[PDB]
Design a protein around this ligand. Structure first.
Ligand code: NA
Length: 158
């Protein structure tokens, strides 16, 4: 399997060197036996200095056997109040779109860093979630207030 060979390489390279505060692991098999290389459970820290700082945002990455020709579906497991996150949790981002900027050479680290950056830099051309898209425009101060509040709720649980 080209997909599983690449995923094992991505995981090995991730364990050797990855950005602090991030996590990217195989998710547990539903039957309890072993790990699912095709579905990763990840965590993204809010970037320092931005509205999401202090929060830890869990996300899944789902791969198919067409990986790396096909990008993973990346989904926050709790939907974030952000214009480019679908109500499903799916991240709307051009490097995650096969027909836009996805390339087989894109790494897991590049995906997670790209999503972290997206959090701080909403894209007005790709609205995916009505309420944060509208609030961002109606009153950015109020948008900031809501995001900061959510960031506190996503601080790692004590
Ligand atoms: Na949710």
């Amino acid at each position: 399997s080209i997909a599983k060979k690449r995923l094992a390489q991505e995981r090995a390279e991730w364990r050797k060197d990855h950005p602090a505060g991030f996590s990217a692991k195989y998710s547990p098999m539903s039957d309890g036996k072993g790990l699912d290389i095709m579905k990763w459970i990840c965590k993204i820290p809010g970037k320092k200095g931005g509205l999401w700082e202090g929060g830890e945002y869990p996300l899944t990455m789902e791969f198919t056997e067409d990986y790396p020709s096909k990008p993973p579906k990346c989904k926050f497991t709790t939907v974030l109040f952000h214009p480019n996150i679908y109500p499903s949790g799916t991240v709307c981002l051009s490097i995650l779109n096969e027909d836009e900027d996805w390339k087989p050479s894109i790494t897991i680290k590049q995906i997670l860093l790209g999503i972290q950056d997206l959090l701080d830099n909403p894209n007005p051309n790709s609205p995916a979630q009505a309420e944060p898209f509208l609030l961002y425009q109606q009153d950015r101060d109020s948008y900031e207030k809501k995001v900061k509040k959510q960031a506190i709720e996503f601080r790692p649980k004590d």
